[PDB]
């Protein structure tokens, strides 16, 4: 009988509530047997999890399971079975990357497939898609600004916007989007993008720290577009992208009625001290050499005494260990009133095992600042 | 950190495809947080899935997530995050009660607790949902006949419409309903049902052998609903609800376009030699002891020289321990290019690690049926 190993299930814990994710109605997702499908035939004796390794035979096991849906979608009889069979191979086809930085060019033709199979499933949903480049400076930045299921122009006044960011290996179309249908249900129009080192654009620009330049551009076009209440605006980020939140609530966040922080934190653990394959993912995000990711995370680092100019929202995890806790708690403190603060007791980075829970919080959240400036 | 033991996560893999089922709209489903908060603080040294004991404090691990989630319905500030939390309720006391056997009255309260999440979440959501009772001579039957999303009287012709069946331990809005999303997805609609000894009627009266009696008085229904072509019906039973199937296709199957049975077979395997959890199942839901259960099943036994009378579609696990694949073979054999086997080599019972895969295929098969007849 086709099984996940004993081993491959204990050693992987951490990385399912991340693979699993949320259960979306748009973003790709996987089934448990497309898990069974990628990591049934994984070769046994390897369970290294910091070893390049495993993520290669990880990277060719999923990649297999992403085929096979890309030959279902190929061969489907509808368009609802297309684009069904498109999600999946989607989903599959992130999990084989995520976590994969060895061979630049196939990291980059998987986020390719993820994008392509996100834009044939735009064309057969019932979602506006908005999709265009906003120039910044010399950079094309990939946009998507999504209106709620059933949405005219003439039958709504000017909608709040959420304004999501990606983490360091997250694909905005899976892990981003399906954050976003959180703001999509109660009727707010949502806007993800890929930055510098973002989404389609890991490992073919390097992730840019102030981020908030990108968001800047996006405040701009939401103010310039009607059918947006620019009065109206979060910011959203998960992750790496929560200290681009952090960022953004210190440098724009006047812009903002609230920013929500997924777990993202006033600055990174040691270096030298993270897990060995979160040093490849840091790496490859800055596209940048073992010995200079120190002076990096050095310049990361927030000064908390420049307070947030907007109510903000943390979500985070007392066992996180990229983003330590204490330093959180220190800006919680600091920044008083403006700050609230979601601490997860026996919770890991990004509280995966609560993100049903407290993206239902957070929402909420969310709605009541926007109705306490008079939504 | 929360997290599943090693140990009982290696010890649960069969389930784990049954528990997440298909990521659904409609249908209640958990997420994987809700697995670890089920499991994390689950008992060590019981791990005897044969077991009463294991499957009391599976119920009353899996209560408690219920319960947090209606805490969160009952506190949501919004109606979208009040059906959210009530789906999430409803999935976690599904796994609570499915394999639970032991308290009766429990086990009906939990079904009890699933339905009224069911019919709240209807009241906030975008189908169209006819419930009403369908009156079998004595018995009053729990129908539900769901329209796609949208659906307007004038604005469509006569609606093709499938039949679902649960299984032993199906929930009717759980699995049954995640099933008929396929079929919703594609513009038709579906009828879902508790006939005696399913759904909310399982350990309240006995499941019947002669489910067709009650299949017939919902075509009898579906004939005289004008919104519905009678002419375009299709019977999808799951595991025990597949034997139903072939029954229904032996006895009435002239009024359907075609039918599909996930799994059943034309006899169940010996009682005896059934996994001990299995003997219990079957027992509760027939309300019967052990010593009378073998000569129940001699009596569900079919008569495969008895033709069915229209097309059928199959799908089943060579591994299957409860209806084996010989007998199934036997079948395809002798109701020849009138029944289709899609056979899956390594899947147990279902094929739950293929279950996306096959209900793409499935409903698109369905699809060519009605086409067939001339939709």
Redesign the interface.
Known sequence: ????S?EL??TC??F??R??F????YAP?V????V??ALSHFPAGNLDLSSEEFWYEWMINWSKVGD?YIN?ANS???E??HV??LR?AAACYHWAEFMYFSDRSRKIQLREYIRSCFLSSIKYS?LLVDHQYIVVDKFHMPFFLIFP??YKEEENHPLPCVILSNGLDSMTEIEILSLAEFFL??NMAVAIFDGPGQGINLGKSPIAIDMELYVSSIVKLLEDDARINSNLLCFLGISFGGYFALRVAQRIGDKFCCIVNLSGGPEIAEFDKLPRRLKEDFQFAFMQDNSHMQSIFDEIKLDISLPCKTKVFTVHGE?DDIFQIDKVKKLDQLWGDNHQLLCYE???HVC??????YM?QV??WV??QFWLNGY
């Open positions: 009988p086709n099984r996940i004993p299930l204990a814990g951490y399912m509530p693979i699993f949320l259960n979306s109605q997702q089934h448990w047997g497309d069974v499908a096979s279902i489907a009889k509808s609802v079975s069904r069979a999946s019932d299921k059933g249900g109660k066992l026996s919770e890991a995966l095992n609560k993100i049903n829970e239902i929402s909420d709605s009541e």
